[PDB]
Design an enzyme around this catalytic site. Structure first.
Site, PDB file in Angstrom:
ATOM      1  N   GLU A  11       0.897  -1.252   0.175  1.00 48.24           N
ATOM      2  CA  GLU A  11       0.116  -0.074  -0.077  1.00 48.24           C
ATOM      3  C   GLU A  11       0.811   1.199   0.136  1.00 48.24           C
ATOM      4  O   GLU A  11       0.452   2.391  -0.409  1.00 48.24           O
ATOM      5  CB  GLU A  11      -0.955   0.215   1.298  1.00 48.24           C
ATOM      6  CG  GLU A  11      -1.942  -1.082   1.268  1.00 48.24           C
ATOM      7  CD  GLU A  11      -2.942  -0.933   0.279  1.00 48.24           C
ATOM      8  OE1 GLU A  11      -3.188  -0.110  -0.454  1.00 48.24           O
ATOM      9  OE2 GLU A  11      -4.091  -1.860   0.246  1.00 48.24           O
ATOM     10  N   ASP A  20      -6.506   6.397  -4.899  1.00 42.79           N
ATOM     11  CA  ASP A  20      -5.944   4.925  -5.080  1.00 42.79           C
ATOM     12  C   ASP A  20      -6.249   4.425  -6.381  1.00 42.79           C
ATOM     13  O   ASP A  20      -6.356   5.245  -7.212  1.00 42.79           O
ATOM     14  CB  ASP A  20      -6.876   3.958  -3.818  1.00 42.79           C
ATOM     15  CG  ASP A  20      -8.353   3.691  -4.311  1.00 42.79           C
ATOM     16  OD1 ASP A  20      -8.778   4.227  -5.469  1.00 42.79           O
ATOM     17  OD2 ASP A  20      -8.976   3.270  -3.512  1.00 42.79           O
TER      18      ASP A  20
END
Ligand SMILES: [Cl-]
Ligand SMILES: [Cl-]
EC number: 3.2.1.17
Length: 161
Positions: A11, A20
């Site tokens: 991440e 994202d």
């Protein structure tokens, strides 16, 4: 290696609001803020999560605190889910990390869809599971990360990380 180190790699760490892979406002270590296209909506969610007026920026400490909360939430979600809990509990510790990774990324709205994969995992048919897991939007949209997670399910080792 453990779930925190694994997810840190998958991440990353960003201290200001970003989008994202799906185009959603996110911050820290993969903390999804909102699916809303309104950046003001994301800033509100951020202030609510942190408990102060952040104006779209947080510290590393705050990022790690959200990360801890989010990992804990993913685990508890699994254990409360009647479909996921027996498969999770059947796994070894390294493969349990792969499971948490998935839920962290995907949430558990995909449970019905991954039914066949989950059965193969509980049966410990690792190569068949790995092939089945790759037959997914998940694999096709984030193949590098999905490959790492699937390899972890297949082998029960940290070789992909
Ligand atoms: Cl919070
Ligand atoms: Cl298959």
């Amino acid at each position: 290696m453990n779930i925190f180190e694994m997810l840190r790699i998958d991440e990353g760490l960003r201290l200001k609001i970003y989008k994202d892979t799906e185009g959603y406002y996110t911050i820290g270590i993969g903390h999804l803020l909102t699916k809303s296209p309104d950046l003001n909506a994301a800033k509100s969610e951020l202030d609510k999560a942190i408990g102060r007026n952040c104006n779209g920026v947080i510290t590393k400490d705050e990022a790690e605190k959200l990360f801890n909360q989010d990992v804990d939430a993913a685990v508890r979600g699994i254990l409360r889910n009647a479909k996921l809990k027996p498969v999770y509990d059947s796994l070894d510790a390294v493969r349990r990390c792969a499971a948490i990774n998935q839920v962290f990324q995907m949430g558990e709205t995909g449970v019905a869809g991954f039914t066949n994969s989950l059965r193969m995992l509980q049966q410990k048919r690792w190569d068949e599971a790995a092939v089945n897991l790759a037959k997914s939007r998940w694999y096709n949209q984030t193949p590098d990360r999905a490959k790492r997670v699937i390899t972890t399910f297949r082998t029960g080792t940290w070789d992909a990380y």
